[PDB]
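Supplementary Note 2. Why include the ligand at all?

Several targets in our set were suspected to adopt different conformations when bound, so apo predictions alone were not considered sufficient. For every target with a known small-molecule partner we therefore ran a joint prediction. The input for protoporphyrin IX containing FE is given below.
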Amino acid sequence: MPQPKTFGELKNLPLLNTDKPVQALMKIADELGEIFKFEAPGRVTRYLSSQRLIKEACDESRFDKNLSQALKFVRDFFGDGLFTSWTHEKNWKKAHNILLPSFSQQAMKGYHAMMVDIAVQLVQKWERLNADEHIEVPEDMTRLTLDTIGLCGFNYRFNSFYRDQPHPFITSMVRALDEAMNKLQRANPDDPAYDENKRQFQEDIKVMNDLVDKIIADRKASGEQSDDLLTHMLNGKDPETGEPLDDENIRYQIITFLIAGHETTSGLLSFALYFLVKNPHVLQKAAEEAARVLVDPVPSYKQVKQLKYVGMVLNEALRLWPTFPAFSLYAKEDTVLGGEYPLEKGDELMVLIPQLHRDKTIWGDDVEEFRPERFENPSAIPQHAFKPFGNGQRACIGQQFALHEATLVLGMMLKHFDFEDHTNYELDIKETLTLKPEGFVVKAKSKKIPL
Ligand code: HEM
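The joint prediction is reproduced in token form.
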């Protein structure tokens, strides 16, 4: 099996001592091909990049979700929430069954009004800019997506658009995820030099956990008859065990949904707008759909479902830059991958989603081009070729929520504004386990359509 350059007794570990590890891993994959071994002290994994091999890795009878080294570190705050629990933990399947009804079609129609509430605040912010003022795109998209999960999921208002600086929850969430990414490259984690990093880390987690207490305390005290994600967490019973979630698991789910429910979606909207302003003919086509379909001051749920081309733009943005770029798997038993790489039970794999999404045998030769038309008929895509939301029973539970929000917001953006890439921005991808085009700015000129 191919393997990139090694560093003596540190093996390949120094290759991930960079600000852009995923981007470093993609270039290794370009150099070495569909599979490559990556060793660290006392650790080994195999990075897969081709649909040929990933279609076997997505075989659930042979491989199950692994918690990567990164996810093990985040589990200190995510606990046994849906995202950081093993498939075999009781709390995974319980919460899985209890919370899927929160993403039913009827649940989605119920979220739509509060999504519009936040989308209108975004549009109003941009409409209220003075001449020649610009937009900080990932910053405002994070304002929107954080507020949307807070309100739709928990009837809690982060009021991000009333702030020039990030919400304290996000300040502690980013620093706590920074501490988790730095534990990967640190030899002796229980050494006195990191005594204060750990002090910071645990105070950043109590910031996040104090908000959680408030969301819970205000639901119990509230009179309003709510039917949202928190309703199901507090009241839903698992049809299989007959049990509801317990108090400590509930806290983990709230923290999980608040973080997983906004970061990757903000990344998606950021990349989508980036590709639109870089591809003016695509932007014009998407804008024409938005104008044709969104005939009312606020979009209906049905109208969002009719934004076919906008949906295609979002999928094409997810192909080039899947915002959660790598997922980890482990072999359920001894097995042979691709008829030439034998694996033993427990052997770990990493699916490099951006490399899978550039497989020339599936997508053709123009893999770097932004062409939404490749999603004209989504059924034409072979199995396991397009995986921005993961695999099987461990796939993203919030997929339809993220895509409905992103389609709604992007449709309104295209309806209400013309956009200008006034700095001719140079794509610079920031990695914090998720991806975002750092420093992306635009100018918007309103088409002066009332809300
Ligand atoms: C474009 C936006 C999103 C992307 C690209 C994305 C990506 C993913 C991926 C790749 C996984 C599988 C993780 C793994 O295999 O380790 C996943 C799982 C998950 N996502 Fe998302 N996600 C997005 C939005 C959301 C939203 C909006 C929510 C909540 C409302 C959410 C909540 C979760 C949860 C709880 C899981 C774990 C599910 C389980 O294992 O049962 N995500 N997501």
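Residues 65, 82-83, 96, 149, 256-257, 260-261, 264-265, 268, 322-324, 327, 388-390, 394, 396-398, 401-402 surround protoporphyrin IX containing FE (CB under 6 Å). The chain has one domain: 1-451. Comparable summaries for the other entries are listed in the accompanying table.
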